[PDB]
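ugh ok so i messed up the first submission bc i forgot one of the chains. this is the corrected input, ALL of the components this time, i swear. 608 residues overall. if the numbers dont match what u have on ur side tell me asap before i send this to the collaborators (the ones from the other lab, u know who)
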Amino acid sequence: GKINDHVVEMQAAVIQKHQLILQEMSKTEVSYKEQEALHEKETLQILKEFEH
Amino acid sequence: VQEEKKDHQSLLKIQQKKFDELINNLIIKYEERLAKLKEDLELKLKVEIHEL
Amino acid sequence: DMPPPWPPKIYIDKEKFLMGTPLGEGTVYYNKVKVDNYAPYSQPDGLVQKITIFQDYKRLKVKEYRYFYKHRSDKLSIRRRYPFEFKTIEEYEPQKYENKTIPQALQQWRQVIQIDRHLRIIKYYHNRNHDGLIERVEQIGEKTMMFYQNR
Amino acid sequence: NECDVYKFICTTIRPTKLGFLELYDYQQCSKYLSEFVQYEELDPPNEFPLVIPSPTNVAVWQKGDCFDMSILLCSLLIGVGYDAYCVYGKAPREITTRNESLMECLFLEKGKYIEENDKKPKQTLEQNENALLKKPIAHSKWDQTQETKAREAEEEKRRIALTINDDEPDELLEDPYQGQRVHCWVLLRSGKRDVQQNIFIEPSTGRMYSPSTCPYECVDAVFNNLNFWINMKPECEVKNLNFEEMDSSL
Amino acid sequence: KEQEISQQDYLFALKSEHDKQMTLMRQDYERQVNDIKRKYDLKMQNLTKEME
Amino acid sequence: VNILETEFDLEREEMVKTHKTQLKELEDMIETVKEEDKKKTEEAQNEFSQF
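and heres the new structure output, hopefully the right one now
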């Protein structure tokens, strides 16, 4: 019983850490998405200029 | 007069909240029934074709 | 002791108060402006107020015509007119669903700005259209345009 | 009064608060009064009118001097629950004749067309330390301001060459009665119906002006429906005349 | 007594304008609910139709 | 006694006039709400019968 309760607190703390890590990662992809979209918009504007 | 106007404005805000929540919940359940009706239609086609 | 007001209380009427200005029309000269206020429901087109913006204090050259209407069937609350461009701008307020008499063709025109004999940019609602049309800019002689969403 | 039988001004105020919304609001009531009666020009503007009518006939007869509509407004304010007094004295002609083809036209904005352009809401992008901004590089604001100055000089020369300085009104003439006119207005004292402080009202045109900048010239006495107060020191401006020490202060 | 009557009238005008406010805003929220209902009706009907 | 009855007679007259006037004027809305209800019901009824 004692091992179970304390190990459970163990994985609960580890789960908090891993959830914040997941948020870290997902914001990573989000930031990549915004910056990439900026890159393609600038490239497409320049390409439209050259098509004109 | 001032305090009754305060109470009436509070009532207006509470009713705004109540009806906005009503609309939001109603939209959620309608969308749920739209998806369920989509599935209803796929298995209606399924039963029709299989019976024939 | 100071005696309270000797006369009985003041009196005013209903239609007279609705009429607004003393002779039905009130005109005065603002700083380079000419303001004329008429009673609504009396004008066949029904203009309520006219703030003629004159380019100077003379009250001669109009700057920005400002038609104002209310109670109309079409609900044309205001008309904006630009003299130099002849530019006509109007916008439409939201209308009720439970009004059977008014056809949907009436429930389409949200904003219209027309300039010259050719140009007319008109704009519609997000959530009150059927085929997805958003805004259409009619250019006379060159092209036709149509924007879509919720399609 | 119209019967020419002697009357006391203090008893001549008849506050009548009709149920109408339009006259409940001091601001809106003043606006409606300004847009409801063409103002009759005092003559002589430097003196007292032949007859002082009560507010009933004042609203009935649709025309009159400053006192008529002023007493009407002050009585309405008193009835509503505000803090209102009537103050008459010396004021500029611009107030009396209702000539304001030079005064600020607050109506010049209404009807304005504002471009609801495609300036989209700049989304709430997350400013994570991982995503960096664009690096600054060596660019010179010296040439930039040179360029802007050149452009501005361009349009200035163009407007001078294409525009003339004939933007000249017709000057409003001197008032023979200016400096001795008898014009009246309504003063709001702070305390009743949430009045911040004393504010002066233009019943003739429905214009609001303050003692520290009001165009009023003299303050010889003030009155109400209950008490009459006199000003032993009117030589000074309305700014230095306390409107709250009316009774106790010497 | 004139001030009492005027206060009574002002209070009832405030109550009546509150009545009008509530009536109109509730009617407008119900009109919005109906508008949402009919837009969803039309979308559902359309999609089910070409599926049919 | 006569004067004290008289001024209260006038006050009673005034309050009677006031209450009668508000009672007469105020009642104009329930009819509008009921008519709206019936008209919307009939409109919803007609095209459903059509269907």
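quick check: The radius of gyration of chain C is 22 Å. that seems consistent at least. Residues 52 and 70 of chain C are 18 Å apart (CA to CA).
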